[PDB]
Design an enzyme around this catalytic site. Sequence first.
Site, PDB file in Angstrom:
ATOM      1  N   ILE A  66       4.172   1.903  -4.352  1.00 55.34           N
ATOM      2  CA  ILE A  66       3.636   0.623  -4.839  1.00 55.34           C
ATOM      3  C   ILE A  66       2.264   0.808  -5.477  1.00 55.34           C
ATOM      4  CG2 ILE A  66       3.062  -1.800  -4.244  1.00 55.34           C
ATOM      5  CD1 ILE A  66       5.964  -1.283  -3.658  1.00 55.34           C
TER       6      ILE A  66
ATOM      7  N   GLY B 248       0.763  -1.245   0.000  1.00 52.38           N
ATOM      8  CA  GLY B 248       0.000   0.000   0.000  1.00 52.38           C
ATOM      9  C   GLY B 248       0.795   1.297   0.000  1.00 52.38           C
ATOM     10  N   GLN B 249       2.117   1.219   0.163  1.00 55.28           N
ATOM     11  CA  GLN B 249       2.992   2.400   0.079  1.00 55.28           C
ATOM     12  C   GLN B 249       2.773   3.182  -1.213  1.00 55.28           C
ATOM     13  OE1 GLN B 249       6.542  -0.045   1.551  1.00 55.28           O
ATOM     14  NE2 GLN B 249       7.407   2.033   1.373  1.00 55.28           N
ATOM     15  N   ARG B 250       2.931   4.504  -1.129  1.00 53.56           N
ATOM     16  CA  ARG B 250       2.672   5.407  -2.257  1.00 53.56           C
ATOM     17  C   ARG B 250       3.434   5.004  -3.519  1.00 53.56           C
ATOM     18  NH1 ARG B 250      -0.710   9.847  -0.432  1.00 53.56           N
ATOM     19  NH2 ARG B 250      -0.848  10.378  -2.657  1.00 53.56           N
TER      20      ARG B 250
END
Lengths: 175, 161
Positions: free
Chosen positions: A72, A68-70
């Site tokens: 990714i 969910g990291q920006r």
Amino acid sequence: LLSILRKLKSAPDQEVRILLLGLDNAGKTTLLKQLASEDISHITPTQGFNIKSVQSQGFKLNVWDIGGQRKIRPYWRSYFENTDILIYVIDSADRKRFEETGQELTELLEEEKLSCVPVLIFANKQDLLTAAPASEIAEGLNLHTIRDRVWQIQSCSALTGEGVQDGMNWVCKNV
Amino acid sequence: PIGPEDVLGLQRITGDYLCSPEENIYKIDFVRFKIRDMDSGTVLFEIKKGRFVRYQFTPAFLRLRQVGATVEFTVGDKPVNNFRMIERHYFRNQLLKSFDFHFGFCIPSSKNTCEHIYDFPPLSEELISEMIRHPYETQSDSFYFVDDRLVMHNKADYSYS
Ligand SMILES: Nc1nc2c(ncn2[C@@H]2O[C@H](COP(=O)(O)OP(=O)(O)NP(=O)(O)O)[C@@H](O)[C@H]2O)c(=O)[nH]1
Ligand SMILES: [Mg+2]
């Protein structure tokens, strides 16, 4: 996952693909390992995907957890194809990020490749004292304005397991 | 130009490695393997780490009913389109187990996991004692394709003593 498979086994194509999305830190991988009866102690941020491919009696249940990291997130689109159920996970106690998560959910529900796909929203981390209740999150995200699909919001704690089975029971009924 | 079609009907282990290391242009790297019994929860084997592996297992592995098998892999700087894995286990001209998984897209510089949770095939007592009695005659091929083209090939043999 084993029992979930058996609850879905009547599905005519004999395969179900579940996509797990949500902001970084929402609890996606924790939820996945919870469902898989796996130790949840070695979890770090997902820089890629985690898959559980459950196969029995020629039935196939594939659950995909995408980071969910920006950095990714732009790749979420690469995993939309052939999705039968979207599970969207929200950290119910991270209020500063409610607008960020609403924005991402809004985008997902406009995506061509996700049209008509049932969506379960997990209002996760309900074990936390400051966690917003599901009904409040639903109001904030205007879930009642969803036209094009079946949806459900479910209070849960991926950490403790509470609420998880109720969510997955809705999923099984709506494949 | 080896493809999935060439591999899916094979009735035995490959005679030799089917590609060189240099053909792994995507720098895909398997860094962890884990086997667990889904029933008792027990992790029967885990390794946290060059294309050959010898596994030292026990007869208990052959009597399992519900198994979780995890692979963990990293990817280099290049994005990978249509990544696919085909793994096949054999004993003496008999196919024991086959796994075919289409990963699709792999993110550059990612670290990814896949756990196959499956019903262990009920091997006959004849077959079981035969594979226990002959270590390393149980073997596996792991084939890795990028857009229908073989880019990596790993091999293993197994002992159940
Ligand atoms: N208190 C509480 N903490 C939770 C709960 N679920 C997950 N967490 C915690 O929240 C943190 C992030 O969880 P993780 O599963 O890694 O989230 P993720 O959505 O997979 N993050 P990413 O997308 O970056 O991989 C972890 O420290 C985890 O222990 C929960 O239900 N209650
Ligand atoms: Mg994660």
